[PDB]
Design a protein around this nucleic acid. Structure first.
Lengths: 557, 40, 335, 151, 541
DNA sequence: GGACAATAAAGTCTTAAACTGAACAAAATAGATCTAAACTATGACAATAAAGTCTTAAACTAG
DNA sequence: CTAGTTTAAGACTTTATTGTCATAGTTTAGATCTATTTTGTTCAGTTTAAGACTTTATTGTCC
């Protein structure tokens, strides 16, 4: 038949069923603000349903199922107090009889100190809203009419003036300010209302508010780096030609201070110095996927996650060149200060399989076994990968703010610092950083091109700029001391642009060499120019030897 | 009239219906078990 | 006087079988547990729920959500044609017997104030669910204890559910009780069968049940947790969710179902149960189709292999490096 | 490396190289009947040679190093006075400078009583056919259209 | 899914993406001349893309990075000076935050003495055009309105003042100019602009009779109009050469038949005057003369690799670098056949001036091992156990050693000579060729050799060509088989082949070889033939 | 047919007067960039006032 | 009687409207810079028609 607390229409009037009992049905109207529940017989209701006067519907007070008032709020306390006050009446069996309802009402009034009208209102709300305690929540959410409009105040004539000024000035126009429109409105208001003094016009605050309302519109990873170096005793061999000898190698490495993780490396075949370690620093700031791929090693980004510039470099300015210091401090914003004492990390990398000599940093001095470098580089790369990824450090010091589930592995510390301490590193382009840190020397210019170290170079920019004529000047060029093929000329003193120059025909017979053996060959040629006078006598002796041999051989026949 | 007689007959004893439907329940459970065994 | 819908009670049991998916017959789900709701006056079963974890009252509220709805759809979905007379159980009861201290606070608040259901103390149990199950299976005792979210064999579920439903219907409609304590007012021609007693009580004493709608009742009884908000969306239990209303406070909260990780219900303002639906993002898309227990197990496995696996991998990689270094050096020396 | 009086092809045009001093090369084209020699840098010619825009070819006037005209013939005399006319200009270190060249042309015009156009033509023909006296023999051998039918 | 410096359309407005970081994307509009970058979330961008309000396009500043202003142009220094101003702000990681940005702007203002609006404009230009230094090049290429006309407006005259005053070109004058050009100049040839100007003057006279003659448009204005919108587009290497000769007293023999005795050898050498280097040589067997020294001169101008290789000596181009003609040959013009001098002067352009007093640099080559007798050049008049091979080898090796390693003592070094430059012939040659001379001149060896050989008149008969009482014949003489004073060049060391000149006036030659009925003289030289004939004549009478 | 003019056709050369094109310097004119001082839009805080809901006291009222 | 209703007054609850700051970023007139177009003057090198010279094929007069 029907359920409890369900609403029906009886001649376009909503009613709620309160109780169903054998032979009787009690209901109430939920449209007015007075009344009491009333009962009648089910047969009448069946008759009205058959005629079509009763129809089914929904509950206008269903939203009260979503309410959960917070503690120590007015709604919560008021609901609890109202329910406590009216509880004894609705629990009684004879709650729909006027007499017993009366005695209960005055019984509540006597002990709760409340008038009868409030008790009747509470009972009415409970019966008309759905027979739940959430039906006794006050309507304070209605106060203030949220979302609705409410030293002269604003008048409808003033509102019309505002709308007029906005309509002809602000709307469908660009480049117009609000202050000039306010000035125009002030002019209009003054020329309509001359009586009002000047200090009583509406302000620009009100004008702007109306216009806006009515017309909506500590130290983590990457903080500082360090540099170390070591020497390996083995002599290396050229890969393509197994007879050439290069020499014993020297290894430079770059270390993160926080996580003690290795970021870059370099291999050089001369005495260690701070000028050459800058190539290791350049390598440390790049992406090593290509270099690992070229050595038959497959790598992922996760394995070596170290690309970008650091914040501080730990090295002594005394042993570096001035242009390098200036480029680091000013051009790339990297601070340089004193280097702490170093420990044997590079020897720890290499001591596992080779004998090592102590390496000491000296000054830069330019001017006058069948293992190959490829296998050596592969071995060093794989050793670095293993040491970074899987080896656990025992002497590493742990600070207080570390989880107990964090092992002393450099990559885990790096990732923890990325996710908790320092974010990420800055971006840089590789070619500019690589060129800006090479050693440089003064060059000369003539009709044969650019002269550096006795070699001659040429390019397309010097030809187009017609320089060979109007520049015969103190110009600098950067050179890589490993290959003589290319140099980089700086066309203006203290500039940022460089031009690339290649070897000319006069010097192409030095192609493929490095500057060290070029200087060696030049020393040998100087010695030959010295001892040509002694060579002349040997040449003469060979001459008479051949002459006499030929004469005696002819005399034999 | 026949429906009332059928209802009275069903409500008379209902033990035979109880036993027959228990047998049917056991039979269908065994059928489902056998089908599950033969499924793989 | 007591009648149908005056008191409801909960019971649970565990069955010693292992279940598999209906389509993929090679995935083991686990041992099943059964929850049932009993009406005290008629001793009739009103709702059910199948779980796969430790019995608890927090999870037992889903059998109460089931108990108040119309069961024609689920019976039809399991290839069973049913009529209303066989299961007449739609509406809200008066009192629910359970442990008030073992439930969450929001659940009790919603039950008491918003739906007007009184929560009282539970009586001792009997072998009701056990008696349902032990007919053709093996049973071990099940004990309710606290809710523990977070980090700490040829039969399918479809056939098990079909058997359970048919057994429930048989016991409700046709079986006759023996130890039932009859009342004086009962007609002599009324046998102790649950549906007959239900009909007599509804005709004579109680009247009907109370109105309710299922979506609000189900959402109000789910578990909740605090969430985080950032440029990656909403973070709950380590997973990421997003929705249309987010792309448009310090203590926000969301409701979740521990059975499917696909959707959550965020509550934007306090003091109301209006919610927004949030779905999984691609950043967590590889967790689709799983449950929360499986996700917590996977996270436990991931956080487990970080104590001895470190040294094991250290040693393995060390000898691998030694081997590759030695073979490379030997090959170089040979040439 | 190039020699004096050698012919090269630049973008499929023939040019003859006339002089080399301190990284500068003077050259003239030998296709049209107008123009003056131009100078540029040697490294630019190296650039051109690098990407195949400048190749070597054969001299179209080698047949003039086979001619010995007899005395008391019109070619002999004409070549003699044509060489004596422009001898002052070609023996100067400023022959490739426009202004001094103009002054020398004016001097020859005044002293020999000849037209400026004739002097410019003689200079062009001397520079185009290999810088020898034999480059100033007239083309009278084609006159008459020998071995043809007049019709 | 997004890349740095990518341009997208959002509600038909272009936006450029500047950075991506942990869920945030920073973007900036590139259409207006105000604003600052904004940041949003990537999920919102995905929603925008899926809905259909966001699409991809091309960057309107892709050409910017491929630019290169020349140095000393205002663009270069302005770019370099402006990029140095905003460097501390773009090097910061807090450059997208308003308060830190304000602090950085204040620091820049205090340091570089520049206003705040300029800094904001520079930052906007850097961000809107692609985050490159070329984004800081000014727009001075737009000033002056290049490529547009200035005739419609104004009243005054543009240009210099007449050294009295003309007029300004107006559109009606332009119409008259175009009418005249179309009438008298277009689609014709051989017509001059002066007569077209004369024709325009008459039309201007009849249209504007009031205006005097001195206020007409001039010919420069007409020509500029027509061109604008009717386009028609000291000493050194290889400068002087000298000749010297000597005689050795030893008697040489044939290499194969050691019984035969050839005689006393004569040696000719050619010397570079500048670096005192030996450029060529020739071995004779008679009294020295200039006609035979021409062969040494021929050898001096060729490549010496082949002749050295034939004698089992291996050298390179750097050892004997002398290929080409010198400017001057220094010998006696009187004692030469006229055709030789004519060929040298006219066809090859080599001057011949008188020789200076001689020296003894040939003796130093030859006197080191053998005794030498005095040698004297005189007029031409034709009509032991040691082979020539070993003698030639010895001479070549001595010359090579003298040229490469010996150091001169009496040589006077030039002022410009570097101190570290040894006084060695090859070093001086290379230095002078690198700094002063440039290069030598080109020549063909066969023509030069044939042009300097001796010549003799021949006779025609049935047997063949008669030279010095010998008979020659060839293929080409058979076609015609014919007496207008023909002539032939001969080599006085071998009688096998002669070069006939059929056409007078040109040195085109035919090759002729000995016939069968006179080849009993084969293999030997003209001197032996002359001796045999002389002794036969003496003993036959 | 031989021979000797011998007349004419085809190609090359010089002149004389005129013309031309590139380069420089000075006018007039058009667009771009910076300064210096003032200005504008926006957000945060505090105060004030309007609009709605609530109970009390006392008499009233329909039955 | 009697069970249920009406009204005026004062306090409470919620929120819209307004007054002052503080500051990151923008506007504006005027001066100066950078580049252009248009015209006057000069000079090194070029064009063009007419006639003359150079060479040789084709024909005439004669045997």
């Amino acid at each position: 038949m029907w359920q409890i607390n369900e609403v029906v229409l009886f001649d376009n009037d909503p009613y709620r069923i309160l109780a169903i009992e054998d032979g009787q049905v009690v209901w109430m109207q939920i449209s007015a603000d007075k009344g009491v529940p009333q009962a009648r017989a089910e047969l009448l209701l069946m008759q009205y349903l058959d005629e079509g006067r009763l129809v089914r519907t929904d509950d206008p007070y269903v939203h009260l199922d979503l309410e959960e008032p917070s503690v120590d709020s007015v709604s919560f306390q008021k609901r609890e107090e109202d329910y406590r006050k009216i509880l004894p009446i609705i629990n009684s069996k004879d709650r729909f009889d006027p007499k017993v309802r009366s005695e209960l009402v005055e019984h509540v009034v006597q002990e709760h100190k409340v008038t009868k009208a409030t008790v009747y209102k509470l009972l009415r709300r409970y019966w008309q809203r759905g027979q739940t305690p959430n039906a006794l929540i006050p309507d304070y959410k209605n106060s203030g009419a949220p979302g609705e409009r409410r030293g002269t105040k604003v008048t409808p004539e003033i509102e019309r003036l505002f709308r007029l000024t906005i309509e002809k000035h602000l709307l469908n126009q660009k480049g117009t300010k609000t202050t000039v429109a306010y000035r125009r409105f002030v002019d209009l208001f003054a020329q309509y209302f001359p009586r009002i003094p000047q200090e009583d016009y509406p302000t620009l605050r009100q004008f702007r508010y109306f216009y806006d309302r009515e017309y909506p519109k500590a130290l983590g990873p990457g903080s500082r780096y360090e540099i170390d170096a070591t020497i390996a005793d083995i002599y290396l061999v050229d890969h393509h030609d197994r007879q050439k000898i290069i020499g014993r190698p020297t290894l430079y490495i770059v270390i993160d201070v926080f996580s003690r993780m290795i970021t870059g490396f370099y291999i050089g075949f001369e005495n260690p110095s701070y000028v050459v370690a800058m190539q290791a620093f350049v390598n440390a700031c790049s992406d090593k996927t290509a270099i690992c791929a070229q050595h038959d090693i497959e790598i992922s980004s996760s394995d070596w996650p170290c690309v970008g510039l650091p914040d501080v470099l730990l090295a002594d300015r005394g042993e570096l060149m001035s242009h390098q210091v200036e480029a680091l401090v000013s051009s790339f914003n990297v601070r340089v200060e004193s280097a702490p004492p170093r420990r044997g990390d590079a020897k720890g990398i290499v001591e596992s399989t080779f004998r090592t000599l102590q390496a000491e940093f000296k000054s830069f001095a330019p001017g006058i076994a069948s293992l190959s470098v490829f296998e050596f580089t592969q071995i060093i790369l794989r050793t670095i990968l293993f040491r970074n990824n899987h080896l656990v450090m025992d002497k590493y010091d742990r600070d207080a703010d570390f989880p107990t589930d964090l092992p002393s592995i450099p990559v885990q510390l790096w990732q923890w610092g990325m996710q908790h301490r320092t974010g990420s590193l800055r971006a840089v382009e590789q070619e500019q950083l690589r060129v800006a840190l090479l050693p440089r020397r003064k060059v000369s210019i003539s009709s044969f091109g650019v002269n550096l170290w006795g070699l001659y170079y040429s390019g397309s920019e010097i030809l187009r700029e017609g320089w060979l004529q109007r520049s015969t000047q103190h110009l600098e060029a950067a050179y890589d001391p490993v290959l003589v093929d290319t140099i980089y000329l700086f066309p203006q003193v203290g500039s940022r642009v460089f031009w690339r120059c290649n070897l000319t025909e006069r010097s192409r017979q030095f192609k493929g060499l490095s500057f060290w053996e070029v200087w060696d060959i030049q020393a040998q040629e100087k010695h030959n120019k010295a001892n040509a006078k002694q060579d002349e006598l040997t040449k003469r002796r060979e001459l008479e030897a051949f002459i006499q041999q030929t004469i005696q051989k002819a005399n034999k026949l | 009239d026949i429906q009332a007689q059928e209802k009275h007959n069903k409500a008379n004893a209902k033990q035979d219906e109880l036993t027959k439907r228990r047998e049917l329940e056991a039979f269908i459970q065994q059928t489902i078990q056998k089908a599950n065994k033969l499924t793989p | 006087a007591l009648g149908p819908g005056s008191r409801y009670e909960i019971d649970a049991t565990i069955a010693d079988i292992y279940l598999v998916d209906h389509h993929d017959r090679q995935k083991i789900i686990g041992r099943p547990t059964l929850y049932i709701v009993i009406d005290v006056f008629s001793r009739m079963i009103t709702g059910f729920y199948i779980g796969f974890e430790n019995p608890s009252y927090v999870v037992a509220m889903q059998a109460f959500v089931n108990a108040c709805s119309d069961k024609t759809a689920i019976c039809a979905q399991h290839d069973i044609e049913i009529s209303s007379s066989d299961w007449p159980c739609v509406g809200l009861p008066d009192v629910l017997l359970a442990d008030r201290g073992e439930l969450m606070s929001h659940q009790v608040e919603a039950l008491v104030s918003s739906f007007n259901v009184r929560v009282e103390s539970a009586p001792p149990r009997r072998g009701d669910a056990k008696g349902i199950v032990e007919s053709t299976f093996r049973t071990l005792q099940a004990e309710f204890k606290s809710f523990a979210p977070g980090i700490v064999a040829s039969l399918s579920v479809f056939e098990f559910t079909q058997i359970i439903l048919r057994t429930i219907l048989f016991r409700n409609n046709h079986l006759v009780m023996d130890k039932y304590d009859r009342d004086a007012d009962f007609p002599t021609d009324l046998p102790s069968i649950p549906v007959q007693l239900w009909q007599w009580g509804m005709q004579h004493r109680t009247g009907s049940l109370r109105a309710v709608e299922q979506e609000q009742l189900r959402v109000a009884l789910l578990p909740r947790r605090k969430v985080s908000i950032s440029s990656f969306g909403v973070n709950l239990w380590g997973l990421y969710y997003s929705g249309s209303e987010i792309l448009r406070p310090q203590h926000l909260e969301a409701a979740y179902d521990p059975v499917l990780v696909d959707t959550i219900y965020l509550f934007p303002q306090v003091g109301s149960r209006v919610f927004w639906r949030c779905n999984l993002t691609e950043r967590s898309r590889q967790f689709k189709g799983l449950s929360f227990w499986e996700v917590w197990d996977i996270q436990a496995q991931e956080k487990h292999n970080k104590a001895n696996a470190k040294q094991d991998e250290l040693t393995k990689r060390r000898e691998l490096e030694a081997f590759i270094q030695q073979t490379i050096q030997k090959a170089n020396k040979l040439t | 490396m190039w020699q004096i009086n050698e012919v090269v092809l630049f973008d499929n045009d023939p040019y003859r190289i006339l002089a080399i001093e301190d990284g500068q090369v003077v050259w003239m084209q030998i296709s049209a009947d107008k123009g003056v020699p131009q100078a540029r840098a040697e490294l630019l010619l190296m650039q051109y040679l690098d990407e195949g825009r400048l190749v070597r070819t054969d001299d179209p006037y080698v047949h003039l190093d086979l001619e010995e005209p007899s005395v008391d013939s019109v070619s002999f005399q004409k070549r003699e006075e044509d060489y004596r006319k422009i001898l002052p200009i070609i023996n100067s270190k400023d022959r490739f400078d426009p202004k001094v060249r103009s002054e020398l042309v004016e001097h020859v015009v005044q002293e020999h009583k000849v037209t400026k156009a004739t002097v410019y033509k003689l200079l062009r023909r001397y520079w185009q056919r290999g810088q020898t006296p034999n480059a100033l023999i007239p083309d009278y051998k084609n006159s008459g259209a020998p071995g043809e039918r007049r019709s």
